[PDB]
Amino acid sequence: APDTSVSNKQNFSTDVIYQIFTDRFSDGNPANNPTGAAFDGTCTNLRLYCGGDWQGIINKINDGYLTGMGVTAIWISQPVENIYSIINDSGVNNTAYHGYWARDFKKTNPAYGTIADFQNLIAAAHAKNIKVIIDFAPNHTSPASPDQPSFAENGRLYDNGTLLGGYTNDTQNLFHHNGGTDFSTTENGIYKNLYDLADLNHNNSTVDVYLKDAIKMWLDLGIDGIRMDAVKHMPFGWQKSFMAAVNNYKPVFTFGEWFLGVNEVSPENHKFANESGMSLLDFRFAQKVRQVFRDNTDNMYGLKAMLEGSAADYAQVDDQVTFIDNHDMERFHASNANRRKLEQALAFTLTSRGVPAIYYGTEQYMSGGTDPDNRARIPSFSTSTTAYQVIQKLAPLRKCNPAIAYGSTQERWINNDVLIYERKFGSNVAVVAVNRNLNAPASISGLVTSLPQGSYNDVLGGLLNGNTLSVGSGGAASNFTLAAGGTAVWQYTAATATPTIGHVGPMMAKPGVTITIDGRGFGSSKGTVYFGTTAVSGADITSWEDTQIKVKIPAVAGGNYNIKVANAAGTASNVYDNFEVLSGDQVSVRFVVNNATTALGQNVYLTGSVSELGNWDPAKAIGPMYNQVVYQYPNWYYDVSVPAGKTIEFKFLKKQGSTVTWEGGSNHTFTAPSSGTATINVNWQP
Ligand SMILES: OC[C@H]1O[C@H](O[C@H]2[C@H](O)[C@@H](O)[C@@H](O[C@H]3[C@H](O)[C@@H](O)[C@@H](O[C@H]4[C@H](O)[C@@H](O)[C@@H](O[C@H]5[C@H](O)[C@@H](O)[C@H](O)O[C@@H]5CO)O[C@@H]4CO)O[C@@H]3CO)O[C@@H]2CO)[C@H](O)[C@@H](O)[C@@H]1O
Ligand SMILES: OC[C@H]1O[C@H](O[C@H]2[C@H](O)[C@@H](O)[C@@H](O[C@H]3[C@H](O)[C@@H](O)[C@@H](O)O[C@@H]3CO)O[C@@H]2CO)[C@H](O)[C@@H](O)[C@@H]1O
Ligand SMILES: OC[C@H]1O[C@H](O[C@H]2[C@H](O)[C@@H](O)[C@@H](O)O[C@@H]2CO)[C@H](O)[C@@H](O)[C@@H]1O
Ligand SMILES: [Ca+2]
Ligand SMILES: [Ca+2]
């Protein structure tokens, strides 16, 4: 099938995600509605169940609400069974309507529906070319008190009805008992409780295996993608091993949530997205968009800096999931603000690089403060809104104009309030003009583009006061006036002749796994696929077409490879880097080195004989290691993803900048478990 097919679980770049709070969307089956003080059909009390369910979602798919909008994917709340207890906070009754308080990852939340309702959801969706994404929060269970075991469900964890354990009397050590995080450090927010949520111990084989098995069930249920909750709160090493479990089984688009604040730029964030085997929700993008379009705390020069910076920081920028708001922030639209602010932000998001995500209700100009004011019930299903028509006109461009889905981004004109960018991919072009100034028009002159000679109509049809564009020779555009609050989209599409790689997924897996290569101009006849210098052809290429190729990963040594294709004629394409080949199936192992004294600013890293350890390359060493929570300096620790059952040689190193100090003596050795976890405790060798 084509790259734009609904069957494409590896690529969402051409889609438009619609984030749905199940409970707050549509109650299609009143029979499964929670009763008593846990329910509020009037949805006046936003901390209780309102009745939203999967059936309701199906109804909205079948009636044309979502399809008419141009939405090609839906991201729903966590489907797993949540606690049934009504948590009373200082007089405020609280329920697990959000689905974030898991009690059993192998069962569904009855309020949402049964397993059969879920299966029906997948079918109905797929039938309308809509992909299904599920929220997955394996960082914790529920709110618990080690003190008062009577509080909530004591964060109890069940395995398909079978009680595994609780936060109180945790003899098995399923959870972390390190207190609560203050978000002070990364390590602090990782090994300590997120709020009062019972923190899961991923270093426990039981938890490790259980979680990896739970997801496999969902995978089997036909999901097309996963949104990983609180990724900055779980060990990176375990998550990688988790991604490998998914990838080496049934690959699906996965993106996690790594909360970033205003003007917050984390290098840890970048590394995670680049090496974890999963992408992230673009918090850098969302925050900046809000500054520029919402609060006006930054200008177009800031938006531009964000675009060009992110493009350099993310190996796969096109994989980052963009948004303007969500269930954890104030809704973009302020009740007293000009709607044109939201419309423009929408238009910008839909035409920018990455994977656009729209928080349900946006199209309806919903306003609301922080949680839970931002999670009100959708007030209507009207298609007559401007924001609705905007998405409806721009959404589809992601499927018909590859420049928007995989294209580069280039600034072609800029000032405080105006921004004109160009998206380009192969013989495809898209030019977007935005004027955030709602009071003053802008005189556009000297604009140059990649558009062919001719006249271009505004894709938005003037909806946002857009205009036509006249392009002469050299793509030089005729002088024009950009109206206040004006937004215009111009484009040009044409068949690509040369093989052009626009996307790859999964980005990490072991040999034998089938990956997906999307782009243009691959030809209809099988060509050759290159993993570094290794050529692949014939049978291993399970599928080949102009826009998509399906090939199995060759049995090459573990490492980082550049992907490249060639058509039947021998014409090579562009390179697609950062593709990681695993040494095999993965396990999560905790490494511990004792008596490793360092100087302030100097950290300890881990290196080893496997690609998962950097193959003895200090530039690729694991770390910096931790030394606060679980173990304390001069004791360091770190959870790493390593090939299972493999006998690995390793050493530790002290690094300051690029300067390296090796551990003395001989290499440490050990055989990775074939399953579950392990803990390697060693002493620094002088
Ligand atoms: O802001 C967070 C912080 O976290 C990480 O810091 C790393 C360091 O980069 C690593 O070096 C390591 O730190 C170790 C030191 O290596 C080790 O020597 C020891 O440090 C002692 C010092 O010996 C002592 O002099 C004391 O220094 C003073 C400073 O002189 C003063 O300027 C400052 O105001 O206060 C300190 C505290 O008195 O500091 C400690 C006292 O025990 O112990 C630490 C381990 O804690 O590991 C940490 C991670 O925990 C990031 O790498 C770093 O960039 C970031 O700044
Ligand atoms: O050239 C191939 C070489 O590769 C591998 O050697 C690695 C060592 O096993 C490993 O210990 C590490 O060596 C460092 C020492 O530990 C340290 O004391 C000091 O001597 O620096 C060394 C790094 O230069 O890294 C090397 C790889 O560079 C393999 O195991 C060897 O058999 C082989 O000779
Ligand atoms: O003419 C090419 C030129 O176009 C753009 O420059 C704009 C600039 O952004 C405006 O602020 C204003 O000064 O008009 C210029 C047109 O002359 C691009 O920004 C620039 O890179 C490019 O060279
Ligand atoms: Ca219901
Ligand atoms: Ca945690």
Swiss-Prot record:
<feature type="binding site">
    <location>
        <begin position="145"/>
        <end position="147"/>
    </location>
    <ligand>
        <name>substrate</name>
    </ligand>
</feature>
<feature type="binding site">
    <location>
        <position position="32"/>
    </location>
    <ligand>
        <name>Ca(2+) 1</name>
    </ligand>
</feature>
<comment type="similarity">
    <text>Belongs to the glycosyl hydrolase 13 family.</text>
</comment>
<dbReference type="InterPro" id="IPR031319">
    <property type="entry name" value="A-amylase_C"/>
</dbReference>
<keyword id="KW-0106">Calcium</keyword>
<feature type="binding site">
    <location>
        <position position="27"/>
    </location>
    <ligand>
        <name>Ca(2+) 1</name>
    </ligand>
</feature>
<feature type="binding site">
    <location>
        <begin position="193"/>
        <end position="196"/>
    </location>
    <ligand>
        <name>substrate</name>
    </ligand>
</feature>
<dbReference type="Pfam" id="PF00128">
    <property type="entry name" value="Alpha-amylase"/>
</dbReference>
<feature type="site" description="Transition state stabilizer">
    <location>
        <position position="328"/>
    </location>
</feature>
<feature type="active site" description="Proton donor">
    <location>
        <position position="257"/>
    </location>
</feature>
<feature type="binding site">
    <location>
        <position position="140"/>
    </location>
    <ligand>
        <name>substrate</name>
    </ligand>
</feature>
<feature type="disulfide bond">
    <location>
        <begin position="43"/>
        <end position="50"/>
    </location>
</feature>
<dbReference type="GO" id="GO:0004556">
    <property type="term" value="F:alpha-amylase activity"/>
</dbReference>
<dbReference type="GO" id="GO:0043895">
    <property type="term" value="F:cyclomaltodextrin glucanotransferase activity"/>
</dbReference>
<dbReference type="InterPro" id="IPR017853">
    <property type="entry name" value="Glycoside_hydrolase_SF"/>
</dbReference>
<dbReference type="InterPro" id="IPR013780">
    <property type="entry name" value="Glyco_hydro_b"/>
</dbReference>
<keyword id="KW-0328">Glycosyltransferase</keyword>
<dbReference type="GO" id="GO:2001070">
    <property type="term" value="F:starch binding"/>
</dbReference>
<feature type="region of interest" description="D">
    <location>
        <begin position="496"/>
        <end position="582"/>
    </location>
</feature>
<dbReference type="InterPro" id="IPR006046">
    <property type="entry name" value="Alpha_amylase"/>
</dbReference>
<feature type="region of interest" description="A1">
    <location>
        <begin position="1"/>
        <end position="138"/>
    </location>
</feature>
<feature type="active site" description="Nucleophile">
    <location>
        <position position="229"/>
    </location>
</feature>
<keyword id="KW-0732">Signal</keyword>
<dbReference type="InterPro" id="IPR013783">
    <property type="entry name" value="Ig-like_fold"/>
</dbReference>
<comment type="subunit">
    <text>Monomer.</text>
</comment>
<feature type="domain" description="CBM20">
    <location>
        <begin position="581"/>
        <end position="686"/>
    </location>
</feature>
<feature type="region of interest" description="C">
    <location>
        <begin position="407"/>
        <end position="495"/>
    </location>
</feature>
<keyword id="KW-0808">Transferase</keyword>
<feature type="binding site">
    <location>
        <position position="233"/>
    </location>
    <ligand>
        <name>Ca(2+) 2</name>
    </ligand>
</feature>
<dbReference type="InterPro" id="IPR006047">
    <property type="entry name" value="Glyco_hydro_13_cat_dom"/>
</dbReference>
<feature type="binding site">
    <location>
        <position position="227"/>
    </location>
    <ligand>
        <name>substrate</name>
    </ligand>
</feature>
<dbReference type="InterPro" id="IPR002909">
    <property type="entry name" value="IPT_dom"/>
</dbReference>
<feature type="binding site">
    <location>
        <position position="375"/>
    </location>
    <ligand>
        <name>substrate</name>
    </ligand>
</feature>
<dbReference type="InterPro" id="IPR013784">
    <property type="entry name" value="Carb-bd-like_fold"/>
</dbReference>
<feature type="binding site">
    <location>
        <position position="51"/>
    </location>
    <ligand>
        <name>Ca(2+) 1</name>
    </ligand>
</feature>
<dbReference type="GO" id="GO:0005975">
    <property type="term" value="P:carbohydrate metabolic process"/>
</dbReference>
<feature type="binding site">
    <location>
        <position position="327"/>
    </location>
    <ligand>
        <name>substrate</name>
    </ligand>
</feature>
<feature type="binding site">
    <location>
        <position position="577"/>
    </location>
    <ligand>
        <name>Ca(2+) 3</name>
    </ligand>
</feature>
<keyword id="KW-0964">Secreted</keyword>
<feature type="binding site">
    <location>
        <position position="53"/>
    </location>
    <ligand>
        <name>Ca(2+) 1</name>
    </ligand>
</feature>
<feature type="binding site">
    <location>
        <position position="315"/>
    </location>
    <ligand>
        <name>Ca(2+) 3</name>
    </ligand>
</feature>
<dbReference type="InterPro" id="IPR006048">
    <property type="entry name" value="A-amylase/branching_C"/>
</dbReference>
